[PDB]
Amino acid sequence: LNGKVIITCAVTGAIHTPSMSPYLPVSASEITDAAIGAAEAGAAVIHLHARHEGDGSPDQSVEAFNPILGVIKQASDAVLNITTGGAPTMSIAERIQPAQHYRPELASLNMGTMNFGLFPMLNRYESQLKHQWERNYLGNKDIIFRNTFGDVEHVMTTLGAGGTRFEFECYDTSHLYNLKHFYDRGLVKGPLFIQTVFGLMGGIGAHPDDVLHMKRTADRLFGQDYRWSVLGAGRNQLNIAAMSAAMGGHVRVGLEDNLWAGKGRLAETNAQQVRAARQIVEGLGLEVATPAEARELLALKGGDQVNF
Amino acid sequence: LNGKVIITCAVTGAIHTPSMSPYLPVSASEITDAAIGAAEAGAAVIHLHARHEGDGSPDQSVEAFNPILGVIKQASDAVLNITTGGAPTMSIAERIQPAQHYRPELASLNMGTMNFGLFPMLNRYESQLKHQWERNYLGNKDIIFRNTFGDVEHVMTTLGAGGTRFEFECYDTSHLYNLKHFYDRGLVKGPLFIQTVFGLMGGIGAHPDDVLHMKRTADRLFGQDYRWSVLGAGRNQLNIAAMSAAMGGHVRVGLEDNLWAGKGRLAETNAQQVRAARQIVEGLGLEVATPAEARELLALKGGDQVNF
Amino acid sequence: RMSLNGKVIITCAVTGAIHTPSMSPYLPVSASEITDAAIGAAEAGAAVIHLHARHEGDGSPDQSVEAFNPILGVIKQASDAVLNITTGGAPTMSIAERIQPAQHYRPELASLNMGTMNFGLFPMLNRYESQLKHQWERNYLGNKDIIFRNTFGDVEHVMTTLGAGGTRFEFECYDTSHLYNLKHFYDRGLVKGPLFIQTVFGLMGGIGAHPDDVLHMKRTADRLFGQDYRWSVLGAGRNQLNIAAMSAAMGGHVRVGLEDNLWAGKGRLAETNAQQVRAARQIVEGLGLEVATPAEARELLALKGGDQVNF
Amino acid sequence: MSLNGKVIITCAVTGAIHTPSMSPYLPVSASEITDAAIGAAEAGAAVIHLHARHEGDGSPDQSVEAFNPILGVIKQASDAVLNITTGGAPTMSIAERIQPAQHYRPELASLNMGTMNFGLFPMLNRYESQLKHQWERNYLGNKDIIFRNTFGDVEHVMTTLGAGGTRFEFECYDTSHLYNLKHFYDRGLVKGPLFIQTVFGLMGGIGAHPDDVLHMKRTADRLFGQDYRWSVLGAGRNQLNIAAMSAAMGGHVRVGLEDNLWAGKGRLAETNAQQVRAARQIVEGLGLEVATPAEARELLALKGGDQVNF
Ligand SMILES: CC(C)(COP(=O)(O)OP(=O)(O)OC[C@H]1O[C@@H](n2cnc3c(N)ncnc32)[C@H](O)[C@@H]1OP(=O)(O)O)[C@@H](O)C(=O)NCCC(=O)NCCS
Ligand SMILES: CC(C)(COP(=O)(O)OP(=O)(O)OC[C@H]1O[C@@H](n2cnc3c(N)ncnc32)[C@H](O)[C@@H]1OP(=O)(O)O)[C@@H](O)C(=O)NCCC(=O)NCCS
Ligand SMILES: [Zn+2]
Ligand SMILES: [Zn+2]
Ligand SMILES: [Zn+2]
Ligand SMILES: [Zn+2]
């Protein structure tokens, strides 16, 4: 398993909105097409949100995932990673239900309460927004992404009972320290899949110093008992992916995180970003991990042990 | 102004509770004695909270500061820094009122929403808590210390109109990036008094790498247009103060931040921690800044241009 | 500006002086093997070729002026790549021997090593000692007392002597002190910006190849030189592509070549220098960046031009 | 646990880099050096780092005989650990440099971990006009000083001096010296706990920026883990800033006129003890305590002050 790089592809998310790009997957069949194409391009893990087909807004209901999860599983042995973040305005009670019902191999777990600033995107996109909800959502200066110590404890206990393991989303140093508290108490066992998230307004930035700081903090707190993945938001996506691959870590791409393929060019598919990451990985002389290798690296329960 | 180190003394705060130490100042006269003693020991800035005299709980009313501010000002020319943090469970609308009414030279300004974990303190102190409010407060696993982007913009505009400048409390990298957003928009003007806070549960830790990361980030984001202060929580108080003093920064001590004088000994006065910091500063060949020197370094309006 | 944003210079160091012929049949030795290696690497995308020469009989380092005569003109006739002539030679050599090729040929670019250091080749004994066919290889790799001499007076001498010929330098910095040494000379005005600073990772006697080492060298160069430098990196051995990727992702330039790394991948020796250039180019293009042309490298590095050399 | 919070102060009383014309307070004669050492120990320095000088012209003297009126005198007056240089002056050969530590078998000797340039000529801008001695001008003006410490040299010193029970203070002037030490440590030529001194601010070595300090510390942490004790040396005006960083980070500190001639703004340091007192004030201001010689011997695993050949 040495020299295997796990590519996670986050195909749609809840931060970008449909008016920002006609390539953002919205319908259930657009999301499954995107996931299947990304897995076939080399993504061992697919990170999934759902959306209302009517207006494209985030949909975190249990039923929203039924036409998504089984469809991808019939076509691909990729590891399906179900969000517990949903949209950052949502409550824990709403957010936990899909992963709780579907008992996936992986679920995201956001490790601290934070501001979430989407209003930067309002300068670029205000003129082309076709839905009022996009204007209100992106303009909201009071978004709080809630993940208290009690909330995280509750998600760890509830979802852990179903065999689900977590992608721990850490947006700044404090989230690694928060994770260390739960690790020391034994509420999660290794190996920890720790994803350091760079470049979001409200989180740490995407400077090389930020990347090395999160890596050296994770090394110190968890030593050998974790696997490192990175998420570089927006135009930082491939720079930070290349840093991680070169440093022994794993890589997240996807239109959830970055709508662009180059300067003034939108990415047309999730698979396209997977191919770019795979080109970097193979250029390093490394190899992209298969789903089976990702399951071994992350000690996952298996694609035949889920509730879909 | 070269080689002057500003010592801020935070005399009581809202995180420690009275059952933890008989030396924690509770009454107005205890708080004013503490402030005057700290300033005479060499603290140029006194950072102030108030408490209910009955049960010692945090009191962020305008009236609670009335027997405090004028008494200190009559005895000392120290810069009085009024909290806008209050207790981390409080709303912005409650927290803003003292600084809004009294128009101080300096007020704290917390730069991001974050978890605040006090339940660790339950390990050492649970057996000696005298008040039920202390059990409920310390045991609360769902504390959200709220400071959204809209919140912070509101405090900046409202208090800046009274001539108040801020001590920007930055508990992790994202808070420096948050501050950069407002600085770039012109909502606060330099020199920025940036206090990097280490070792709180919910914030960055107190490792030397954590200190350098915050310093390097502030240097890159703000260049020469800021003044750096550190707060090392608990047992980290003097180590981190010494790092800052040796690196051209400023220092915060006080029983708000650390109840201890050494292993197994409570600090009896705020002044005693000021004296320890002053011993480090003078050992380095530096000098402790006077209040007038702090006002020049921080571009403050003056101790007699306040509403008390 | 626009024409140079996102352009990554690939330097290819085709043979060097550290690896020895017994270590790989693909190490270029003869003048024509070296020119073939340089031309193929340039055609694969290397804008700069970094050059040493070797004795054709035993493959040992040859830093005579004559050794470069069948090399430089041949490559220039076939490629417009910038030719970077070593002033390092082998680390056992004196300044008086090392300076003569660049002094004579007046290249656009010459390496300039920025500090005296131990140079340990004995890490190569474990893998290679038994297969060494030449006694000179055994004596060289086993030498525990190699001093790679680059005193303050030496570096000043080389700066003055080669600078008079219009040659600009690739400043080879093997640890923090070499950046500080360069800052001393920059402050005295003995070299002018933009400084082409190459930070070298993983050599025994130099800094290692840990990611922290890379960031430390980058941060130090940023603080000392601000905007007035161009950053390149070199990772020894299996660190070569990892460190090239870090630099490309951070706004720097990259060096590959069999002078630095004999491998193409896991369990696979590199058959050509071009192969390593293609791997670096795949990383650069995967990032959405582009490989710089020789003309772009000349502009980025403020070089005198391929028509202004003595060959 | 009883050694928790103890900070070793080493005092380097004269060295070989500063020269007599730079300061009348730089110790030169044997009795000036012993007075300086005893005063520094009494101020709280648990280790004294020693060089000797020719009494006639003040130039570095690394002969065995030069230490004869020094080592026994200090030992009679103080139980401080005596650390004998094997660096001498940076122009000297290994064979000259090794002889005092080989003969006297000290508890501690310096061990410089890599070959490097040594730039003294910046000191000419400040001090050129007051230089009395021809040797001072030609030494400080020499742009070609190579402080030689090859891999072969270091191996030879480790083997020879280790046979006398001497343990080393590994002087690391840049990252590569830590990596060089890691090579010998992995080969078993030195055993822990390694006493690793990171030297900041010399021309030819790493600078004295806070980034340099944390970089050297995080490198030593990664390469040696728990099996080392950290000391710092900040050259010149960085002396107390870098000492304070180390004390606040769990390390130990070196002061002395070997490293810094100054006390403050335009004020020469009058004694070594004065710099020990400043370091001690920082240590005690942190709530830590200065280590005694016995505590330094335990922290550094030294053979004892009665196990030396003087
Ligand atoms: C560093 C050095 C000692 C390494 O020599 P080496 O032993 O041949 O090479 P490395 O150990 O670094 O890498 C080869 C190993 O990594 C593997 N490897 C190489 N490239 C790889 C890749 N892209 N992906 C995965 N593995 C790779 C090989 O399979 C081999 O594995 P093995 O050790 O299990 O057999 C030597 O190459 C060197 O000194 N280079 C610098 C020379 C120099 O100084 N040049 C001048 C600079 S100024
Ligand atoms: C580093 C070195 C070049 C400094 O030389 P220096 O000029 O005598 O000393 P510095 O410049 O560092 O400090 C003196 C200057 O800073 C000021 N200064 C020094 N200490 C100060 C202090 N504690 N507070 C305030 N100012 C101070 C002085 O007033 C003077 O200012 P000025 O330049 O405006 O006149 C030289 O002392 C040296 O090399 N020391 C190390 C020697 C050595 O190698 N030892 C063995 C190492 S293994
Ligand atoms: Zn998501
Ligand atoms: Zn407060
Ligand atoms: Zn070369
Ligand atoms: Zn010495």
Side-chain angles (χ1 to χ4, degrees):
Chain A
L1 296 172
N2 304 85
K4 296 296 190 277
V5 180
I6 301 168
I7 300 178
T8 296
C9 191
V11 296
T12 190
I15 296 321
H16 295 140
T17 70
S19 297
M20 301 178 180
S21 170
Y23 309 107
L24 187 71
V26 170
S27 73
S29 63
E30 284 162 1
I31 292 177
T32 59
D33 283 346
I36 292 165
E40 290 175 352
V45 181
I46 307 298
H47 167 80
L48 294 164
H49 299 231
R51 295 176 177 271
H52 295 283
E53 308 208 345
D55 65 7
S57 61
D59 184 355
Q60 188 62 358
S61 66
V62 174
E63 51 264 46
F65 287 85
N66 190 239
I68 295 171
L69 294 162
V71 172
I72 302 169
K73 177 175 168 170
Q74 294 329 302
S76 170
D77 67 329
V79 175
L80 303 194
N81 170 343
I82 304 183
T83 182
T84 68
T89 49
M90 296 178 171
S91 65
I92 290 291
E94 163 166 32
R95 276 160 50 194
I96 194 179
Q97 289 313 305
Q100 186 171 353
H101 281 75
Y102 289 110
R103 299 195 296 271
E105 296 182 86
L106 267 178
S108 64
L109 184 59
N110 301 276
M111 289 303 307
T113 301
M114 53 184 286
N115 292 347
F116 219 114
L118 305 189
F119 52 113
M121 279 167 293
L122 254 192
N123 189 88
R124 167 99 69 171
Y125 296 110
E126 179 146 29
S127 60
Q128 73 196 70
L129 295 184
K130 313 317 279 189
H131 299 288
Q132 188 59 35
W133 75 262
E134 303 175 278
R135 205 171 331 268
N136 302 335
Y137 179 60
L138 302 168
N140 186 350
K141 300 184 169 180
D142 299 309
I143 301 176
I144 297 174
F145 190 24
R146 163 170 174 151
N147 303 284
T148 69
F149 289 111
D151 295 336
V152 171
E153 180 175 14
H154 173 242
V155 180
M156 288 173 170
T157 293
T158 301
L159 298 189
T164 302
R165 299 187 57 82
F166 303 109
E167 177 179 61
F168 300 103
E169 322 297 357
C170 301
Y171 304 71
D172 204 353
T173 332
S174 69
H175 297 182
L176 294 171
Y177 278 103
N178 296 347
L179 180 54
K180 176 59 161 177
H181 161 78
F182 292 109
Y183 178 68
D184 286 349
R185 287 178 57 197
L187 302 188
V188 288
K189 295 293 196 302
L192 308 175
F193 192 30
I194 299 177
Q195 173 138 267
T196 54
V197 178
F198 303 98
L200 298 179
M201 180 184 191
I204 198 171
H207 192 275
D209 294 344
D210 298 325
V211 174
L212 264 296
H213 167 65
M214 295 294 286
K215 177 54 159 64
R216 81 170 62 98
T217 303
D219 285 348
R220 182 167 50 79
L221 298 185
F222 309 101
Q224 301 294 302
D225 204 15
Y226 83 109
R227 316 284 178 263
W228 183 38
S229 182
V230 299
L231 189 178
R235 65 177 172 92
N236 310 291
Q237 179 179 65
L238 296 178
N239 288 334
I240 285 179
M243 291 185 76
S244 178
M247 291 167 59
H250 308 279
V251 156
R252 171 162 154 174
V253 298
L255 275 53
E256 162 161 356
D257 303 326
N258 173 35
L259 297 173
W260 305 93
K263 214 184 185 194
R265 201 153 160 177
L266 295 176
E268 310 193 356
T269 64
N270 279 279
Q272 174 184 352
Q273 302 185 338
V274 172
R275 284 194 300 276
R278 178 169 190 157
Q279 173 158 329
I280 294 169
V281 168
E282 291 174 354
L284 289 167
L286 305 173
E287 293 173 51
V288 160
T290 64
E293 292 163 345
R295 293 184 169 97
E296 186 170 347
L297 285 167
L298 301 179
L300 306 182
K301 61 174 168 171
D304 61 335
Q305 306 271 11
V306 301
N307 197 19
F308 55 85
Chain B
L1 292 183
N2 292 125
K4 300 291 181 303
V5 178
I6 299 171
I7 298 177
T8 296
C9 193
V11 296
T12 190
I15 295 315
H16 295 138
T17 71
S19 297
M20 299 178 176
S21 170
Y23 307 105
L24 184 66
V26 171
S27 73
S29 66
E30 283 171 352
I31 290 169
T32 62
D33 285 349
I36 294 163
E40 295 180 340
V45 181
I46 307 301
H47 168 80
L48 291 167
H49 298 231
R51 292 175 177 272
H52 290 287
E53 296 205 352
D55 66 9
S57 62
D59 185 352
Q60 187 60 2
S61 71
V62 169
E63 294 70 21
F65 289 83
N66 182 249
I68 298 172
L69 294 166
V71 171
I72 301 165
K73 181 182 175 194
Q74 182 152 309
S76 166
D77 70 328
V79 177
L80 303 192
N81 173 346
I82 301 184
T83 183
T84 73
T89 46
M90 290 173 177
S91 67
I92 293 285
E94 178 172 21
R95 283 157 48 194
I96 203 177
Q97 306 195 25
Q100 191 172 324
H101 172 76
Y102 289 109
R103 301 188 289 269
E105 298 181 87
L106 256 190
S108 65
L109 183 61
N110 297 279
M111 288 306 306
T113 300
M114 59 187 278
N115 293 347
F116 218 107
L118 306 185
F119 51 110
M121 267 160 306
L122 262 189
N123 177 76
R124 185 156 181 93
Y125 296 113
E126 178 167 30
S127 63
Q128 62 191 260
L129 298 178
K130 270 195 154 76
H131 299 276
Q132 187 54 44
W133 76 259
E134 299 176 284
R135 298 168 196 128
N136 300 337
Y137 182 49
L138 298 175
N140 186 349
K141 293 178 174 177
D142 300 305
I143 296 176
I144 296 169
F145 188 27
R146 175 181 165 141
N147 304 281
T148 70
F149 293 114
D151 292 340
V152 172
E153 182 173 6
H154 172 63
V155 180
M156 287 173 169
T157 299
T158 299
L159 299 189
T164 300
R165 292 176 62 73
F166 303 110
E167 183 180 62
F168 303 101
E169 324 298 349
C170 298
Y171 301 78
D172 208 348
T173 331
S174 64
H175 294 187
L176 296 168
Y177 280 102
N178 293 351
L179 180 55
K180 175 66 159 174
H181 164 78
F182 292 108
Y183 178 67
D184 287 350
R185 286 174 55 196
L187 291 169
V188 289
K189 289 296 187 301
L192 307 179
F193 192 32
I194 301 181
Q195 185 88 245
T196 55
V197 180
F198 305 99
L200 296 182
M201 189 183 181
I204 195 168
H207 192 272
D209 289 337
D210 294 326
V211 178
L212 254 302
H213 172 63
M214 298 290 288
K215 176 57 161 63
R216 281 202 287 264
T217 301
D219 284 346
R220 183 172 52 82
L221 272 41
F222 303 106
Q224 299 283 285
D225 205 14
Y226 86 106
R227 315 286 183 264
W228 181 39
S229 186
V230 301
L231 186 180
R235 66 190 301 182
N236 307 295
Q237 180 175 66
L238 298 176
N239 288 333
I240 291 197
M243 291 188 76
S244 179
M247 289 168 65
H250 307 278
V251 160
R252 172 168 153 166
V253 299
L255 270 49
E256 160 162 359
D257 305 327
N258 173 31
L259 294 177
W260 299 97
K263 201 173 196 179
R265 177 171 299 95
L266 297 167
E268 302 190 5
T269 64
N270 279 281
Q272 155 191 1
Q273 300 181 344
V274 174
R275 289 196 291 275
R278 177 168 191 163
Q279 182 166 329
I280 296 167
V281 168
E282 293 175 351
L284 285 164
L286 304 167
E287 304 188 271
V288 165
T290 66
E293 284 161 353
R295 291 182 171 97
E296 185 170 4
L297 286 164
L298 305 178
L300 305 183
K301 59 172 167 174
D304 44 10
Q305 291 208 103
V306 296
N307 193 28
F308 53 88
Chain C
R1 288 157 309 189
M2 289 265 191
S3 64
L4 300 180
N5 292 337
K7 296 294 190 307
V8 180
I9 299 166
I10 299 173
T11 294
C12 192
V14 293
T15 191
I18 301 305
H19 294 136
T20 68
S22 296
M23 304 179 178
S24 169
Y26 308 118
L27 185 68
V29 171
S30 68
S32 70
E33 288 169 349
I34 289 165
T35 63
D36 289 340
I39 296 162
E43 294 178 352
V48 181
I49 304 300
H50 169 76
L51 289 170
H52 297 233
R54 294 176 176 274
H55 293 286
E56 304 211 343
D58 65 6
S60 62
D62 187 350
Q63 185 64 2
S64 71
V65 174
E66 295 70 22
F68 288 83
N69 186 251
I71 291 176
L72 296 169
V74 170
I75 299 166
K76 175 176 166 173
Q77 276 300 304
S79 169
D80 76 322
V82 177
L83 305 186
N84 172 347
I85 300 185
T86 182
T87 74
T92 49
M93 293 175 172
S94 72
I95 297 292
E97 173 170 19
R98 280 157 49 193
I99 197 177
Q100 303 191 30
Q103 185 173 2
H104 177 73
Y105 290 113
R106 298 193 297 272
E108 299 181 83
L109 257 187
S111 64
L112 183 62
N113 297 281
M114 287 307 304
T116 301
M117 54 184 284
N118 293 348
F119 209 115
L121 300 198
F122 49 81
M124 281 171 287
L125 289 172
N126 190 30
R127 194 189 303 269
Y128 294 114
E129 179 169 17
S130 178
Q131 71 191 256
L132 301 183
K133 298 199 286 300
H134 296 285
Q135 186 66 31
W136 78 260
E137 298 175 293
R138 296 175 194 115
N139 295 348
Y140 186 43
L141 298 186
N143 189 341
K144 301 170 176 181
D145 299 299
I146 298 171
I147 295 171
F148 188 23
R149 167 170 171 152
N150 300 284
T151 67
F152 290 113
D154 296 332
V155 173
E156 173 175 1
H157 174 60
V158 178
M159 286 175 170
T160 302
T161 294
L162 302 185
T167 301
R168 293 185 62 76
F169 304 108
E170 178 178 69
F171 303 101
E172 322 296 354
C173 297
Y174 301 77
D175 208 351
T176 337
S177 62
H178 295 184
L179 296 174
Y180 279 103
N181 297 351
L182 179 57
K183 174 65 163 181
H184 166 73
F185 292 110
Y186 178 65
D187 285 349
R188 290 176 53 194
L190 294 185
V191 287
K192 298 295 195 303
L195 311 167
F196 191 28
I197 299 176
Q198 176 147 264
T199 58
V200 180
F201 303 96
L203 271 48
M204 178 62 65
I207 197 170
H210 193 274
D212 286 336
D213 294 325
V214 180
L215 256 300
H216 169 65
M217 295 294 286
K218 177 52 158 70
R219 283 191 313 245
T220 302
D222 287 347
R223 181 171 53 82
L224 270 41
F225 304 104
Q227 302 290 292
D228 203 16
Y229 83 108
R230 315 285 182 262
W231 183 36
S232 185
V233 302
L234 179 177
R238 67 183 303 169
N239 313 116
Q240 178 181 65
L241 296 175
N242 288 332
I243 287 182
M246 294 186 71
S247 174
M250 292 168 56
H253 307 276
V254 313
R255 167 172 154 167
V256 298
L258 274 58
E259 163 164 358
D260 304 328
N261 175 29
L262 297 176
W263 299 84
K266 183 180 187 181
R268 183 163 56 102
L269 289 179
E271 297 176 25
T272 65
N273 278 277
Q275 193 175 0
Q276 296 182 346
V277 174
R278 290 197 299 273
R281 179 164 188 158
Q282 180 165 325
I283 294 165
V284 165
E285 291 175 352
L287 281 168
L289 305 171
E290 299 178 77
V291 172
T293 66
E296 292 166 338
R298 290 184 169 94
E299 188 73 11
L300 287 162
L301 304 181
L303 304 182
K304 60 180 179 169
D307 59 327
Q308 299 292 331
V309 300
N310 191 29
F311 53 90
Chain D
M1 174 62 56
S2 63
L3 300 175
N4 277 33
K6 300 295 193 299
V7 178
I8 302 163
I9 301 177
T10 296
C11 189
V13 293
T14 190
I17 299 302
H18 294 139
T19 69
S21 294
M22 300 181 182
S23 172
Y25 307 114
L26 184 71
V28 170
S29 70
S31 65
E32 288 168 353
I33 292 173
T34 63
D35 282 355
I38 295 161
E42 292 179 352
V47 181
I48 310 295
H49 170 70
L50 293 166
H51 298 234
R53 291 175 182 277
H54 292 283
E55 302 213 336
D57 64 17
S59 61
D61 186 353
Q62 190 56 4
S63 67
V64 174
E65 294 67 26
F67 288 86
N68 183 76
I70 290 168
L71 294 165
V73 169
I74 296 161
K75 181 180 171 186
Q76 265 305 296
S78 171
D79 69 327
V81 178
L82 306 190
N83 170 343
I84 302 187
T85 186
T86 72
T91 45
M92 290 176 172
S93 69
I94 293 295
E96 180 169 13
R97 280 156 51 190
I98 200 180
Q99 292 189 42
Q102 189 174 1
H103 174 77
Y104 290 108
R105 304 195 289 271
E107 302 181 79
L108 263 185
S110 66
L111 180 62
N112 299 276
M113 288 308 306
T115 301
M116 54 188 285
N117 292 345
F118 220 106
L120 307 186
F121 53 95
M123 286 185 283
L124 279 178
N125 194 92
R126 188 183 298 273
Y127 298 111
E128 181 176 349
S129 74
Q130 67 202 68
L131 296 188
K132 268 197 200 60
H133 294 276
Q134 157 182 319
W135 75 260
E136 293 179 293
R137 179 175 174 86
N138 294 342
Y139 177 54
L140 299 167
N142 180 353
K143 296 177 175 178
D144 301 305
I145 299 172
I146 295 167
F147 188 25
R148 178 201 166 106
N149 303 280
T150 67
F151 292 113
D153 293 334
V154 173
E155 170 167 23
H156 170 235
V157 179
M158 286 173 170
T159 299
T160 303
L161 297 188
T166 302
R167 292 184 61 82
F168 301 114
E169 180 179 69
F170 303 103
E171 322 296 352
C172 300
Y173 302 75
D174 208 351
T175 334
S176 62
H177 297 186
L178 296 171
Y179 278 103
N180 298 348
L181 181 55
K182 173 68 168 171
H183 164 75
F184 294 107
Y185 178 63
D186 284 350
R187 287 177 56 187
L189 294 190
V190 286
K191 293 296 195 298
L194 308 173
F195 191 27
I196 300 183
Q197 182 146 263
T198 55
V199 178
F200 302 100
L202 300 186
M203 194 187 183
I206 196 173
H209 193 272
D211 288 352
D212 296 325
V213 175
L214 259 296
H215 165 69
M216 294 293 286
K217 172 64 157 70
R218 81 170 63 96
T219 304
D221 285 347
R222 179 169 51 83
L223 296 180
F224 307 103
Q226 299 283 274
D227 203 16
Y228 84 106
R229 315 284 180 260
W230 183 37
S231 187
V232 302
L233 187 178
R237 69 179 308 158
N238 315 289
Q239 182 178 65
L240 295 179
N241 288 335
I242 285 184
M245 294 186 74
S246 176
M249 292 167 56
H252 307 281
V253 309
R254 163 163 157 175
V255 298
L257 275 55
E258 165 162 357
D259 306 325
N260 171 34
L261 294 181
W262 297 101
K265 295 192 300 185
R267 193 165 90 268
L268 287 178
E270 295 158 271
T271 65
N272 278 276
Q274 157 179 10
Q275 296 179 346
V276 176
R277 291 194 298 268
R280 178 169 187 155
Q281 181 166 327
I282 298 175
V283 166
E284 290 171 357
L286 283 161
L288 309 172
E289 299 176 85
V290 162
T292 65
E295 293 165 340
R297 289 180 170 98
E298 179 160 343
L299 284 164
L300 304 180
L302 303 184
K303 62 174 167 167
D306 60 340
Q307 301 294 324
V308 298
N309 190 28
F310 54 89

